[PDB]
Amino acid sequence: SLSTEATAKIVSEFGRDANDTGSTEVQVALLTAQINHLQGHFAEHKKDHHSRRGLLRMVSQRRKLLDYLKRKDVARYTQLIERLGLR
Amino acid sequence: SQITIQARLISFESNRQQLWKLMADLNTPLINELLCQLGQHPDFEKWQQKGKLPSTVVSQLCQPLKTDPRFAGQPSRLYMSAIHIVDYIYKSWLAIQKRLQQQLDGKTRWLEMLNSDAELVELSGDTLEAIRVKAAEILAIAMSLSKTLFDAYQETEDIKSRSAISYLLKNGCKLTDKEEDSEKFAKRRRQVEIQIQRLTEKLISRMPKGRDLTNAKWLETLLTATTTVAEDNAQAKRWQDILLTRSSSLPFPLVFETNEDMVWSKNQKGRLCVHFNGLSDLIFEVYCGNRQLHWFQRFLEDQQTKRKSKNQHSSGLFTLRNGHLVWLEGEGKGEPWNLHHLTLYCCVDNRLWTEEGTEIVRQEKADEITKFITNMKSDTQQALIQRKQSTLTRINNSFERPSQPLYQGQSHILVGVSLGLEKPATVAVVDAIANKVLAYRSIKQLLGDNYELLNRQRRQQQYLSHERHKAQKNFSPNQFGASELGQHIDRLLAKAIVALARTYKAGSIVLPKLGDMREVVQSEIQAIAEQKFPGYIEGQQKYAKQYRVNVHRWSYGRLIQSIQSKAAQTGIVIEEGKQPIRGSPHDKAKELALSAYNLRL
RNA sequence: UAAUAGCGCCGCAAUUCAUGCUGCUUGCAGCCUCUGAAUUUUGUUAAAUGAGGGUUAGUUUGACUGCAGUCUUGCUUUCUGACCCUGGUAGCUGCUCACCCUGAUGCUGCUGUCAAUAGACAGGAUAGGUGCGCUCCCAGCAAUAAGGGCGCGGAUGUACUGCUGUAGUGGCUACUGAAUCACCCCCGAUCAAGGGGGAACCCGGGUUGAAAGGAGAAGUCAUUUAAUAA
């Protein structure tokens, strides 16, 4: 999981205001940071079957938050996808 | 009659690495030739209807793949190994599917036919006695009885009077006076409905999957799933089912179906050596215990005897039949050809060891080849016949071999073996003309000094099943079971039963027609559980877990095979019969042997 | 302190016969000295089973020829012995927790010493409960079965381990500590390789624990762990 400094850095950059501890844009940015660091380890230690459980949860949570934001506000959804480099 | 023996093969890296590269490259057309039939082939449903693969189709898919830029680097015998394996994969899978289709139809007839006594009265518009009288007429006509009654129901509808034929069939081809409980009938008719449902859920089976060593689909899916967003729950789960899949680490084995495509020799150091057709640069050294060495010396003696005799003796009687070359998985770190272990598994027909046994195979093949030639009676067909006629003349020229008189047993003395859940075996030796039991054995006698091993097997199954549960909750790789102990116990009983059959000069060993006990129990316990937890499906599954699990762990097919193998190596005939539903384990064994004796005519 | 009960095994006490023991009537009479089946009972320095994790190309189960002489290979497994350990730091990573109640196929349970903090040090497979074990039972913990209660911010169009967080417990990779044995001791080789020196006993030769083998490929179902979904 992320360092303390790394979370604080990510919430301050995706949060719309000093009040955002966990808007849908902050929650997807923290799952995205985790997934990138986890793909770099799980492709190397292919035998680590306890980390595949962690990845498949963490990707599935991101997709639900994105589908919710798509219907709620397509402009916020489009800007979030750009800023996270997703397709 | 056949057995498999084995040795590890040793050879310097360059040879164990070159062979690995050919098998990692061969393993791939073993997958592309399944896909060329899995989805590509248009006729596939005609094969599923017939239950058999056409004898040339895999070769006709492989021949143009021999020049493929991906597959072209391999010897002519490695392509025949590919064609062999893919032929056997589908020739098995289609034959599994056909018997399931036949069972589903063969019970769909019965679910339509199985009626309550009140339904027979309504459907006939007549009395249940009129039905008993017509059932008595049908038995009088009939006198394969069960088959004849199913034929007489298919044909001959006879103004719905075939309802009386269904009355015979549900009563086990016999007349019955009693009128049945509709609750017992409801359980009975429900078991048939459950078996129909489960057969369809099984018949919808997966296609054969090849050993993809590349991880390419898995790596592509990983980078897809982590960098992109799925458009559907079905797509997000499709990536999960791929990412959870464990990939294979070993290529398919080479199969050498011609015994002469292995060449044997003796090394300067006195050790035995082998080489394969198309790999004749790569000499390998045999390493095996002296408990098995006598076959590997016999391989070389069979070969030298033919070569010393200007090919006038045939490998139609060579002790080696076919070889399967396989990489057994090693442990720790290293390149695959330094980590794994080349092992050569030789199929051997054990009755070729002796001269008296070789003469059986000479007569068996000489009769089969004579018939084949007379059935053929083409261009290359003319050369196939010359090869068969030349085998038929050469097979008469004998190898110098060990002599041992054949076993002979008394045609009236039989060993009955009774299998069950609590007693894996129990034995009665019957003189069938005296109607006299010569001896009985229970398990405590039937493996003597080893009787502690049954208690060990039950402790080990229970202990290890709990440890596997605890280990899975922690994602530990430690996953172990009593399978090799159960295999040893089934072999101890197989030796003791045949030693007992030899002791009393028995003419045969009798084994029960157990059939598919696992599926039968699974439907009986479900039809019952549905009456005790209606609507609560989780409670229905929990109803008798330990009984259903003990039936799925019951090794009856492996004990039946272990006895068959050891009996046929000794020369004792195997016979079969219905095992009684009631009586003690001894009475079951007694009546089983007497039933198999009564079935002689 | 506690663990009374339930369930599975292990013998021990009997009772009933036989697949056994004496006869000739080759099928009866007779009993339980053995060897075995069935039921019941029992937990008496009775007897018998008895899963903390690991270690040897180990020994014996082998082939051929008339029980004697030749040849012998180190494969895949099951036991019995014996010995060793109860681990070390260097990264990567999963899960779990605002705080409470219920407490799960949940974790933990040995001897001695110092602390009496939660942990070190030295011993060790006798290691909570019984003759021996359990998903059962007792004791402590319980966030990491599950359900319910419920505080304050963000979000609030159905998403919300998403906040209250530095520890707990795992997984994996690299290096490393001990045993690398089959009567002990010593020097080595692990796709190979053996050699040297002793103790004890039997009648200068042996002995110094035994067993099993049909394998590959594909498909399926049984519970049981994880993820996902309505």
PDB file of N, CA, C and O in Angstrom, chain B residues 148-178:
ATOM      1  N   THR B 148     -35.511 -56.535 -24.423  1.00  0.00           N
ATOM      2  CA  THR B 148     -36.716 -56.988 -25.133  1.00  0.00           C
ATOM      3  C   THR B 148     -37.956 -56.219 -24.685  1.00  0.00           C
ATOM      4  O   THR B 148     -38.765 -55.821 -25.518  1.00  0.00           O
ATOM      5  N   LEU B 149     -38.103 -55.956 -23.387  1.00  0.00           N
ATOM      6  CA  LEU B 149     -39.205 -55.163 -22.852  1.00  0.00           C
ATOM      7  C   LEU B 149     -39.124 -53.695 -23.306  1.00  0.00           C
ATOM      8  O   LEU B 149     -40.135 -53.140 -23.723  1.00  0.00           O
ATOM      9  N   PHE B 150     -37.939 -53.073 -23.321  1.00  0.00           N
ATOM     10  CA  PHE B 150     -37.780 -51.740 -23.907  1.00  0.00           C
ATOM     11  C   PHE B 150     -38.097 -51.725 -25.415  1.00  0.00           C
ATOM     12  O   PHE B 150     -38.805 -50.831 -25.872  1.00  0.00           O
ATOM     13  N   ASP B 151     -37.673 -52.732 -26.184  1.00  0.00           N
ATOM     14  CA  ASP B 151     -38.074 -52.876 -27.594  1.00  0.00           C
ATOM     15  C   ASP B 151     -39.594 -53.007 -27.746  1.00  0.00           C
ATOM     16  O   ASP B 151     -40.204 -52.330 -28.571  1.00  0.00           O
ATOM     17  N   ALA B 152     -40.228 -53.847 -26.926  1.00  0.00           N
ATOM     18  CA  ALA B 152     -41.667 -54.053 -26.916  1.00  0.00           C
ATOM     19  C   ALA B 152     -42.459 -52.822 -26.436  1.00  0.00           C
ATOM     20  O   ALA B 152     -43.654 -52.740 -26.708  1.00  0.00           O
ATOM     21  N   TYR B 153     -41.829 -51.873 -25.735  1.00  0.00           N
ATOM     22  CA  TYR B 153     -42.420 -50.565 -25.451  1.00  0.00           C
ATOM     23  C   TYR B 153     -42.211 -49.576 -26.609  1.00  0.00           C
ATOM     24  O   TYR B 153     -43.071 -48.736 -26.880  1.00  0.00           O
ATOM     25  N   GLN B 154     -41.004 -49.581 -27.189  1.00  0.00           N
ATOM     26  CA  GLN B 154     -40.740 -48.696 -28.353  1.00  0.00           C
ATOM     27  C   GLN B 154     -41.757 -49.087 -29.421  1.00  0.00           C
ATOM     28  O   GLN B 154     -42.697 -48.304 -29.658  1.00  0.00           O
ATOM     29  N   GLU B 155     -41.573 -50.257 -30.035  1.00  0.00           N
ATOM     30  CA  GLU B 155     -42.580 -50.768 -30.967  1.00  0.00           C
ATOM     31  C   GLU B 155     -43.913 -51.032 -30.243  1.00  0.00           C
ATOM     32  O   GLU B 155     -44.021 -50.846 -29.033  1.00  0.00           O
ATOM     33  N   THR B 156     -44.927 -51.527 -30.961  1.00  0.00           N
ATOM     34  CA  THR B 156     -46.068 -52.252 -30.360  1.00  0.00           C
ATOM     35  C   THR B 156     -46.786 -51.497 -29.234  1.00  0.00           C
ATOM     36  O   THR B 156     -46.984 -52.007 -28.134  1.00  0.00           O
ATOM     37  N   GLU B 157     -47.179 -50.252 -29.521  1.00  0.00           N
ATOM     38  CA  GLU B 157     -47.935 -49.385 -28.603  1.00  0.00           C
ATOM     39  C   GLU B 157     -49.285 -49.991 -28.169  1.00  0.00           C
ATOM     40  O   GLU B 157     -49.671 -49.881 -27.003  1.00  0.00           O
ATOM     41  N   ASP B 158     -49.948 -50.701 -29.085  1.00  0.00           N
ATOM     42  CA  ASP B 158     -51.033 -51.648 -28.813  1.00  0.00           C
ATOM     43  C   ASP B 158     -52.144 -51.082 -27.908  1.00  0.00           C
ATOM     44  O   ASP B 158     -52.460 -51.638 -26.853  1.00  0.00           O
ATOM     45  N   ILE B 159     -52.729 -49.951 -28.318  1.00  0.00           N
ATOM     46  CA  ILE B 159     -53.834 -49.256 -27.632  1.00  0.00           C
ATOM     47  C   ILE B 159     -53.471 -48.927 -26.171  1.00  0.00           C
ATOM     48  O   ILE B 159     -54.182 -49.267 -25.223  1.00  0.00           O
ATOM     49  N   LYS B 160     -52.287 -48.335 -25.979  1.00  0.00           N
ATOM     50  CA  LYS B 160     -51.659 -48.025 -24.679  1.00  0.00           C
ATOM     51  C   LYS B 160     -51.446 -49.227 -23.749  1.00  0.00           C
ATOM     52  O   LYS B 160     -51.047 -49.039 -22.597  1.00  0.00           O
ATOM     53  N   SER B 161     -51.614 -50.470 -24.204  1.00  0.00           N
ATOM     54  CA  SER B 161     -51.356 -51.655 -23.364  1.00  0.00           C
ATOM     55  C   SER B 161     -49.872 -51.822 -23.017  1.00  0.00           C
ATOM     56  O   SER B 161     -49.560 -52.431 -21.994  1.00  0.00           O
ATOM     57  N   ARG B 162     -48.946 -51.175 -23.750  1.00  0.00           N
ATOM     58  CA  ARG B 162     -47.533 -51.050 -23.341  1.00  0.00           C
ATOM     59  C   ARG B 162     -47.339 -50.407 -21.964  1.00  0.00           C
ATOM     60  O   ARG B 162     -46.301 -50.608 -21.343  1.00  0.00           O
ATOM     61  N   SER B 163     -48.344 -49.732 -21.406  1.00  0.00           N
ATOM     62  CA  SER B 163     -48.363 -49.354 -19.986  1.00  0.00           C
ATOM     63  C   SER B 163     -48.108 -50.556 -19.050  1.00  0.00           C
ATOM     64  O   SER B 163     -47.350 -50.426 -18.090  1.00  0.00           O
ATOM     65  N   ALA B 164     -48.590 -51.759 -19.376  1.00  0.00           N
ATOM     66  CA  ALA B 164     -48.263 -52.979 -18.638  1.00  0.00           C
ATOM     67  C   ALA B 164     -46.802 -53.433 -18.797  1.00  0.00           C
ATOM     68  O   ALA B 164     -46.231 -54.025 -17.886  1.00  0.00           O
ATOM     69  N   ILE B 165     -46.153 -53.100 -19.910  1.00  0.00           N
ATOM     70  CA  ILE B 165     -44.713 -53.328 -20.094  1.00  0.00           C
ATOM     71  C   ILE B 165     -43.925 -52.405 -19.158  1.00  0.00           C
ATOM     72  O   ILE B 165     -42.998 -52.853 -18.489  1.00  0.00           O
ATOM     73  N   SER B 166     -44.339 -51.140 -19.016  1.00  0.00           N
ATOM     74  CA  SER B 166     -43.737 -50.242 -18.017  1.00  0.00           C
ATOM     75  C   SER B 166     -43.939 -50.742 -16.579  1.00  0.00           C
ATOM     76  O   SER B 166     -43.048 -50.589 -15.744  1.00  0.00           O
ATOM     77  N   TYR B 167     -45.059 -51.428 -16.307  1.00  0.00           N
ATOM     78  CA  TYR B 167     -45.310 -52.055 -15.010  1.00  0.00           C
ATOM     79  C   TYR B 167     -44.302 -53.169 -14.731  1.00  0.00           C
ATOM     80  O   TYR B 167     -43.727 -53.206 -13.646  1.00  0.00           O
ATOM     81  N   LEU B 168     -43.973 -54.004 -15.723  1.00  0.00           N
ATOM     82  CA  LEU B 168     -42.866 -54.959 -15.596  1.00  0.00           C
ATOM     83  C   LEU B 168     -41.527 -54.266 -15.364  1.00  0.00           C
ATOM     84  O   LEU B 168     -40.803 -54.624 -14.434  1.00  0.00           O
ATOM     85  N   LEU B 169     -41.185 -53.276 -16.193  1.00  0.00           N
ATOM     86  CA  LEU B 169     -39.871 -52.634 -16.131  1.00  0.00           C
ATOM     87  C   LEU B 169     -39.621 -51.999 -14.758  1.00  0.00           C
ATOM     88  O   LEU B 169     -38.570 -52.245 -14.169  1.00  0.00           O
ATOM     89  N   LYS B 170     -40.593 -51.269 -14.188  1.00  0.00           N
ATOM     90  CA  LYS B 170     -40.399 -50.638 -12.866  1.00  0.00           C
ATOM     91  C   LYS B 170     -40.323 -51.647 -11.717  1.00  0.00           C
ATOM     92  O   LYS B 170     -39.709 -51.368 -10.693  1.00  0.00           O
ATOM     93  N   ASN B 171     -40.911 -52.826 -11.904  1.00  0.00           N
ATOM     94  CA  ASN B 171     -40.821 -53.961 -10.990  1.00  0.00           C
ATOM     95  C   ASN B 171     -39.605 -54.877 -11.252  1.00  0.00           C
ATOM     96  O   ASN B 171     -39.514 -55.961 -10.680  1.00  0.00           O
ATOM     97  N   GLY B 172     -38.654 -54.468 -12.095  1.00  0.00           N
ATOM     98  CA  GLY B 172     -37.443 -55.254 -12.357  1.00  0.00           C
ATOM     99  C   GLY B 172     -37.719 -56.514 -13.177  1.00  0.00           C
ATOM    100  O   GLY B 172     -37.213 -57.589 -12.853  1.00  0.00           O
ATOM    101  N   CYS B 173     -38.547 -56.383 -14.215  1.00  0.00           N
ATOM    102  CA  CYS B 173     -38.907 -57.442 -15.166  1.00  0.00           C
ATOM    103  C   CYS B 173     -39.627 -58.638 -14.516  1.00  0.00           C
ATOM    104  O   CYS B 173     -39.449 -59.786 -14.925  1.00  0.00           O
ATOM    105  N   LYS B 174     -40.437 -58.363 -13.485  1.00  0.00           N
ATOM    106  CA  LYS B 174     -41.164 -59.346 -12.663  1.00  0.00           C
ATOM    107  C   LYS B 174     -42.562 -58.842 -12.303  1.00  0.00           C
ATOM    108  O   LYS B 174     -42.806 -57.638 -12.292  1.00  0.00           O
ATOM    109  N   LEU B 175     -43.478 -59.760 -11.990  1.00  0.00           N
ATOM    110  CA  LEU B 175     -44.811 -59.426 -11.478  1.00  0.00           C
ATOM    111  C   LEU B 175     -44.755 -59.037  -9.994  1.00  0.00           C
ATOM    112  O   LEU B 175     -44.028 -59.652  -9.213  1.00  0.00           O
ATOM    113  N   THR B 176     -45.575 -58.060  -9.602  1.00  0.00           N
ATOM    114  CA  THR B 176     -45.730 -57.608  -8.212  1.00  0.00           C
ATOM    115  C   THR B 176     -47.207 -57.460  -7.862  1.00  0.00           C
ATOM    116  O   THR B 176     -47.977 -56.848  -8.609  1.00  0.00           O
ATOM    117  N   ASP B 177     -47.605 -57.979  -6.702  1.00  0.00           N
ATOM    118  CA  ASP B 177     -48.942 -57.837  -6.121  1.00  0.00           C
ATOM    119  C   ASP B 177     -49.120 -56.517  -5.342  1.00  0.00           C
ATOM    120  O   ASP B 177     -50.142 -55.856  -5.524  1.00  0.00           O
ATOM    121  N   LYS B 178     -48.141 -56.108  -4.520  1.00  0.00           N
ATOM    122  CA  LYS B 178     -48.194 -54.866  -3.715  1.00  0.00           C
ATOM    123  C   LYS B 178     -48.455 -53.619  -4.569  1.00  0.00           C
ATOM    124  O   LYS B 178     -47.969 -53.492  -5.689  1.00  0.00           O
TER     125      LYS B 178
END
